[PDB]
A paper describes a structure:
[name] glutamate receptors (AMPARs), the primary mediators of excitatory neurotransmission in the brain, are either GluA2 subunit-containing and thus Ca2+-impermeable, or GluA2-lacking and Ca2+-permeable. These cation channels assemble in various combinations from four core subunits, [name]–4, with each contributing unique gating kinetics, trafficking and subsynaptic localization. The ion channel is encircled by diverse auxiliary subunits, modulating receptor gating kinetics, pharmacology and ion flux, with the transmembrane AMPAR regulatory proteins (TARPs γ2, γ3, γ4, γ5, γ7, γ8) being the most abundant.
Desensitized [name]/γ3 substantially deviates from this behaviour and, despite the limited NTD and LBD resolution of this highly dynamic state, we could trace major transitions throughout the receptor. First, the [name] LBDs splay into pseudo four-fold symmetry in some 3D classes, reminiscent of desensitized kainate receptors, and of GluA2 receptors lacking auxiliary subunits. Interestingly, these transitions take place despite the presence of TARPs, whose extracellular loops remain associated with the LBDs, and accompany their motions. As apparent in 3D classes, transition of the LBDs towards four-fold symmetry largely involves rotation of the B/D subunits. Closer analysis of the three sets of desensitized structures reveals a gradual transition of the LBD tier into four-fold symmetry, which is greatest for [name] and smallest for the edited GluA2 mutant: [name] > GluA2(F231A)-Arg743 > GluA2(F231A)-Gly743.
Numbering used by the authors:
A (entry chain A): 566 to 767, 781 to 815
B (entry chain D): 508 to 545, 566 to 622, 630 to 649
C (entry chain A): 390 to 503
D (entry chain E): 5 to 41, 55 to 84, 92 to 158
E (entry chain C): 602 to 624, 629 to 649
F (entry chain B): 602 to 625, 631 to 649
Write the structure that this text describes.
């Protein structure tokens, strides 16, 4: 009963743990079935256990929301713009997290810093999740509002500040410029300009995870139907 | 909690296609077994396919080359799906802000009047 | 005519599409361009938007003690106003005068959304 | 019960063909929020996605299937919709054999080929569903 | 059979969760949790 | 059968935990004693 065809069928059935029509009876045959049964038990258990680890660590990944907590905590190489208020803010900081970030940024090689905001934007876009251009919230928001919208602001703001119109110390334009800014603010001009230039710019396993095993089953069903027709012609001739 | 939460590990689409595959496998296994030279009726095929998918076996097994191809692939599909269900459930049993509430507008937010 | 130093940065100051057809302060567009226009109107002065040469906002190199970028342009006299998104900082306030802030902001993290 | 058995086959073969050929023609496969031209509730199908409400309700466009050969082949199969079309073609041939069975009773292979066509049509329908969901 | 397949997979899945989850170091560890109460000596 | 069912489930569950766990200073050197640390003599 254990010809070449049934031996292949019994071995496949034992590996899929689906049983078989017959079982080996001789001592020599039962030894082969014994180690094959043990081999199947270890491999199938390994496949199920590894898949569980594969789909757990995939979960329990965690995004970031100001990962600055552990700062980069990883290869998201966070940088800043060179010769900007953000670099100076990090350099002169005395907060534990910010001091840790600065000590990392100053010593890290290659330079995490960039020469222009566009350079940092392209560095994050072309680092595929490997760069983070600590930048000002206004620029961050404007960028995230424009295509290729593949970038996003994470967490809140590290601090609060504002832009000002500068003049040389002892300049006669200081007073008029201050009054002009107050006038422009009280008349809604700054609000309208901001709105114009910023706003008006504008789980269960899925079938995709196991789609391959469905194609194999249908492909196997179709092949079996073709094989059956071939034996029909061969037997009838 | 949920009454039918035991179906959560696999999506609703996967469960629907498992039923469709089970119907298709039984019909094909009945077809190739009947018009072949060498008791797989339509009802026996459905019983065998339900047992094969659920790892409980059956008293009768295919004997033809074309019939055994159908049983072999159905067994392999069963092992991947059953292992997938157990692995995903284990992940489920192992393992959110004011900004979130500010960004959305589906949950209405109000203030005190004259305040 | 006063020299108003500025920096290229979207959307504060940008080169207009086909800037070659235009010349001077009219070659650029953006929030800070219109803000400089409105400030000039209210204060009553003429101005030429000169882009900073270094392309840097401003910092005092600790070794040379030299200010570079827009802050350097303002301190050394090469420029009379700066209408760029220039952050108000203590170190800068010690060497240049700032008006009341015209926009609020904070340092924020940007990550590939993918 | 051969007379009733053939009545079930004739009724079912037309019913299967009518049901599948309506699904391919109709555009109510999926209820997803998209844009026909503001994101609004839309109803899509195998060829066109159409808005359910809004100002542009009732007017809609053709689905742009195309924006790593795995995504090329899957999208080319999904764009052409050959598998759902193949099931309709197989059902049409299977229906023809059932009708011709009475008109030609000399050969018995006419009614067996019909049974093969319907099984093949059902298998192609399963693949079309999986490709559509993927 | 279906009741058998669901329950045994539940047993294996939950046992894996039992064995994995089960597996101080700092000041935050005490401040951060609330299950362990921590005290000091009075007038010290 | 009951002994087999519990033991096989235990093997699969413990292996899943085994694979999952590995997938997931000066003070440190001073606190421990398993690693010995030294310096250069007359340095």
């Amino acid at each position: 009963e254990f010809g070449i065809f049934n031996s292949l069928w019994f071995s496949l059935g034992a590996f899929m743990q689906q049983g078989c029509d017959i079982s080996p009876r001789s001592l020599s045959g039962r030894i082969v079935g014994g180690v094959w049964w043990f081999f199947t038990l270890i491999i199938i258990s390994s496949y199920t256990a590894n898949l569980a680890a594969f789909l757990t660590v995939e979960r329990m990944v965690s995004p970031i929301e100001s990962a600055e907590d552990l700062a980069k905590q990883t290869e998201i190489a966070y940088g800043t713009l060179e010769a900007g208020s953000t670099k100076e803010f990090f350099r002169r900081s005395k907060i534990a997290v910010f001091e840790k970030m600065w000590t990392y940024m100053k010593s890290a090689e290659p330079s995490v810093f960039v020469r222009t905001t566009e350079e940092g934007m392209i560095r994050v876009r072309k680092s595929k999740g490997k760069y983070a251009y600590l930048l000002e919230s206004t620029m961050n928001e404007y960028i995230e509002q424009r295509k290729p919208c593949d970038t996003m602001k994470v967490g809140g703001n590290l601090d609060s500040k504002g832009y000002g119109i500068a003049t040389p110390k002892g300049s006669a334009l200081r007073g008029p410029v201050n009054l002009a800014v107050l006038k422009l603010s009280e008349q809604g001009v700054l609000d309208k300009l901001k709105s114009k230039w910023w706003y008006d710019k504008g789980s269960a396993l899925s079938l995709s995870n196991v789609a391959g095993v469905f194609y194999i089953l249908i492909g196997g069903l179709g092949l079996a139907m073709l094989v059956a027709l071939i034996e029909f012609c061969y037997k009838s001739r | 909690p949920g009454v039918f939460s035991f179906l959560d590990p696999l999506a609703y689409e996967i469960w629907m296609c498992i039923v469709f595959a089970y119907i298709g496998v039984s019909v094909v296994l009945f077809l190739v077994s009947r018009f072949s030279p060498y008791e797989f009726g339509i009802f026996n095929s459905l019983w065998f396919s339900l047992g094969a998918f659920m790892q409980q076996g059956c008293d009768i097994s295919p004997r033809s080359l074309s019939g055994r191809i159908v049983g072999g692939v159905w067994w392999f599909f069963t092992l991947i799906i059953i292992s997938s269900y157990t692995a995903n459930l284990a992940a489920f049993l192992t393992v959110e802000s004011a900004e979130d509430l500010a960004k959305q507008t589906e949950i209405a937010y109000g203030t005190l009047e004259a305040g | 005519t006063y020299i108003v130093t500025t920096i290229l940065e979207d959307p504060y100051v940008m080169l207009k599409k086909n800037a070659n057809q235009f010349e001077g302060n009219d070659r650029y567009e953006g929030y800070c361009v219109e803000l400089a226009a409105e400030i000039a109107k209210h204060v009553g002065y003429s101005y030429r938007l000169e882009i900073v040469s270094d392309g840097k906002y401003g910092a005092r190199d600790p070794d040379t003690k030299a200010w570079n970028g827009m802050v350097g342009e303002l301190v050394y006299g090469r420029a009379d106003v700066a209408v760029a998104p220039l952050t108000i900082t203590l170190v800068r306030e010690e060497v240049i005068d700032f008006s009341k802030p015209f926009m609020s902001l904070g340092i924020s993290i940007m990550i590939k959304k993918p | 019960d051969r007379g009733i058995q053939m009545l079930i086959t004739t009724v079912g073969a037309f019913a299967a063909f009518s049901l599948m050929t309506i699904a391919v023609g109709t555009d109510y496969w999926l209820y997803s929020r998209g844009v026909c031209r503001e994101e609004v509730m839309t109803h899509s199908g195998l060829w066109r996605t159409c808005c359910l409400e809004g100002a542009f309700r009732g007017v809609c466009k053709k689905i742009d299937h195309f924006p790593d050969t795995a995504e090329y082949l899957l999208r080319a199969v999904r764009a052409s919709s050959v598998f759902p079309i193949l099931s309709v073609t197989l059902l049409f041939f299977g229906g023809l054999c059932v009708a011709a069975s009475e008109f030609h009773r000399s050969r018995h292979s006419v009614i067996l080929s019909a049974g093969i066509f319907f099984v093949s049509a059902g298998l192609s329908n399963i693949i079309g569903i999986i490709v559509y969901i993927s």
